[PDB]
């Protein structure tokens, strides 16, 4: 009784650095639609066996969704290091949720490249588990103030991608969604 279509069959999506924070409750979720989706190939699901998660139903249905490059989809895994996992998006360890990723090159591709998506490169702090830290301030490598005007080593925050029609499948960006399920001390859970 909740719109999983508008998060699955949508057309406007966020990026790695600004993944959408969504909370959904008070409905029923058709878990079986994934097993017969006929379009999912990377159902590397975690935390609970696909067959066990069917009957159970709880709160904290936190959902995440963004895009990622092709060959680096494996970096999305709890307790596993990676370029995004170490600098762009931490995964809360012991993650008792489930993830879905698939290839959708038919719509997220244009001639000449798609220079809209970006990702960060460096930071001072560390990626705490389940943290999104959007920022625009530029870090520094020297005491010289790069105050807005262009400079040598003032750590320009993000760099874009290129999604050309001739790009290979392995380099083609895959759409990824993330689901988590656990409980809070408050009783009377809401099923799905």
């Amino acid at each position: 009784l909740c719109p999983f279509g508008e998060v699955f069959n949508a057309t406007r999506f966020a990026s790695v650095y600004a993944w959408n924070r969504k909370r959904i409750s008070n409905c029923v979720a058709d878990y079986s639609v994934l097993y017969n989706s006929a379009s999912f190939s990377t159902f590397k699901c975690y935390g609970v066996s696909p067959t066990k998660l069917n009957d159970l139903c709880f709160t904290n249905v936190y959902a995440d969704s963004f895009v990622i490059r092709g060959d680096e989809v494996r970096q999305i895994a709890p307790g596993q290091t990676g370029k995004i996992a170490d600098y762009n998006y931490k995964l809360p360890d012991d993650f008792t949720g489930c993830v879905i990723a698939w290839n959708s090159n038919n719509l997220d591709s244009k001639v000449g490249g798609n220079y809209n998506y970006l990702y960060r490169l460096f930071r001072k702090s560390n990626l705490k588990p389940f943290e999104r830290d959007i920022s625009t301030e530029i870090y520094q490598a020297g005491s010289t103030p790069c105050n807005g005007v262009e400079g040598f080593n003032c750590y320009f925050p993000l760099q874009s991608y290129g999604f050309q029609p001739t790009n290979g499948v392995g380099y083609q960006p895959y759409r990824v969604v993330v689901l988590s399920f656990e409980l809070l001390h408050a009783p009377a859970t809401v099923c799905g």
């Binding site: 490169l121 460096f122 040598f152 760099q159």
Partner: protein
């Protein structure tokens, strides 16, 4: 590993030799990809520069930005480190993410002597950056009167 990088920063010539005689990797780098040839060039430790290249230091090493130690030497204003790297076979046409050549870097800070050193090994006078500006175009903006003459003479 970690010892060799910080030793290159501190300018410890003797500490360089003890660790390098231990079989340490000559092309080790930090998470940012900074090889210790970068550190020796940036800090201006001429003695460390000579020692590393003797046993096969990566003269074309690049960081996450693609920076070369020649770029650091050119921008800092180090005289004899630049030439010895060119003697070892340093590349001159490499462009970073911004596309700045080592010739461009000397133009910004007015390092006159570095300009001819790279030019003697074949530095491109008409090189473009990401903005399309040249080292000659750097001179007119920064008000360096003399530096524009050398590039124009070689134009």
């Amino acid at each position: 590993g970690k010892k060799l990088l910080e030793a290159a920063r501190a300018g410890q010539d003797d500490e360089v030799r003890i660790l390098m005689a231990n079989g340490a990797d000559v092309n080790a780098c930090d998470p940012s990809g900074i090889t210790p040839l970068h550190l020796a060039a940036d800090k201006g430790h001429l003695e460390i520069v000579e020692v590393l290249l003797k046993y096969g230091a990566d003269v074309n090493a690049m960081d996450v930005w693609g920076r070369t130690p020649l770029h650091l030497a050119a921008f800092t204003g180090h005289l004899e480190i630049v030439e010895v790297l060119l003697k070892y076979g340093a590349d001159v046409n490499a462009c970073d993410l911004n596309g700045y050549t080592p010739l461009h870097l000397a133009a910004g800070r007015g390092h006159l002597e570095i300009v001819e050193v790279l030019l003697k090994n074949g530095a491109g006078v008409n090189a473009q950056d990401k903005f399309g500006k040249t080292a000659f175009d750097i001179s007119i903006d920064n008000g360096n009167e003399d530096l524009a003459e050398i590039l124009q003479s070689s134009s």
